[PDB]
């Protein structure tokens, strides 16, 4: 019946995919509270929606910076995919709009913060704790991949912990609807599949590789391939070698060997039996996949709640103006946004 659930999920997705929501709010409808993250690739602010009093994470992209970084098509992918998808462990896009200078994506706010923060502080997660999160990623990728979507940026930085201790996958900046293969060099160095590094055509198998890296990092406290510079990381990744902490269970070690597999004919997720090779692996023997989808499972860790607008689980960033030019920038490039 997962086959039947997914058939229906595709019908729902395709309707929104073929006729996207556009211009569903305005900047003036939100009160700016705090910057929750930045980057060359943009910034995110906590905002309060006046008509509801709801708190949201508003992603703000500078159209001119997007163009300079050659991320126009990628940004159009992000918004078009996010408005069309619907799954418990995906961050929901509530509103999107644009003005003369910027693009806006208003997402649900997860006050628990990023997995990254909690993982670095605590050090590592126990295998059951890691398994609880990995299961949610297995289900999310099953969903996304069925809609012909490749995610391409799995990492702790992009997984928010919600108020029930469950995961929300965020940042769809490299997500792409592709039947067959694609070639863009993108991702985060520690998480890149070897075929990406080697400039081959690649497919959704690169996400299953990334799952291997995440599970490893969650359970070990550090990624399987690290060094001071990206080049040194890429050398390690393509080497064909990986070392596991002595505290890694036999089952974990075996799952990771089949995920972090350079040979695509052997990598789990990519075989004839698809995601069931992963779902039915011994390491997940205790996982009730339906109970996880339904959020019936008790979460191993619940973030300390201090109100809907509390930012204590996020770091402090330098605040920066939201300037809006009186001349429209990049009108044609982002016409469909």
């Amino acid at each position: 019946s997962v086959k039947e659930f997914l058939a229906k999920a595709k019908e729902d997705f395709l309707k929104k995919w073929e006729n996207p929501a556009q211009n569903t709010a305005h900047l003036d409808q939100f009160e700016r509270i705090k910057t929750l993250g930045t980057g060359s690739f943009g910034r995110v602010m906590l905002v309060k929606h006046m008509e509801t009093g709801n708190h949201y994470a508003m992603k703000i992209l500078d159209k001119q910076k997007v163009v300079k970084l050659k991320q126009i098509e990628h940004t159009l992918n992000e918004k078009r995919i996010l408005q069309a998808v619907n799954f418990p462990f995906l961050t929901k896009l509530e509103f999107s709009f644009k003005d003369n200078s910027n693009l806006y994506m208003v997402m649900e706010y997860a006050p628990g913060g990023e997995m990254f923060s909690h993982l670095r502080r605590i050090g590592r997660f126990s295998e059951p704790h890691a398994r609880f999160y990995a299961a949610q990623i297995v289900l999310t990728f099953e969903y996304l991949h069925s809609l012909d979507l490749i995610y391409r940026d799995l990492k702790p930085e992009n997984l928010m912990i919600d108020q029930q201790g469950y995961i929300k996958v965020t940042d769809f900046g490299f997500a792409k609807r592709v039947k067959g293969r694609t070639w863009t060099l993108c991702g985060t160095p520690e998480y890149l599949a070897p075929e990406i590094i080697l400039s081959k055509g690649y497919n959704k198998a690169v996400d299953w590789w990334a799952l291997g890296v995440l599970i490893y990092e969650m359970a070990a406290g550090y990624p399987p391939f690290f060094a001071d510079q990206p080049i040194q990381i890429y050398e390690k990744i393509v080497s064909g070698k990986v070392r596991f902490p002595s505290h890694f269970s036999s089952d974990l070690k075996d799952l990771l060997r089949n995920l972090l597999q350079v040979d695509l004919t052997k990598r789990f997720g990519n075989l004839k039996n698809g995601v069931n090779d992963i779902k039915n692996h011994k390491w997940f023997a205790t996982t009730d996949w339906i109970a996880i989808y339904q959020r019936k499972v008790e979460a191993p860790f619940i973030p300390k709640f201090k109100g809907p607008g509390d930012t204590s689980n996020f770091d402090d960033y330098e605040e920066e103006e939201i300037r809006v030019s009186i001349n429209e920038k990049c009108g044609k490039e982002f016409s469909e946004f």
Binding site: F41, E157, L185, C186, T188, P189, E190, Y222, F226, A227
Partner: peptide
């Protein structure tokens, strides 16, 4: 230890995406 090497590394903070 591997942990000690990671913590002494320059990549224990948030990691930026890459591109062409």
């Amino acid at each position: 230890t591997t942990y000690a090497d990671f913590i002494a590394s320059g990549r224990t903070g948030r990691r930026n995406a890459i591109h062409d």
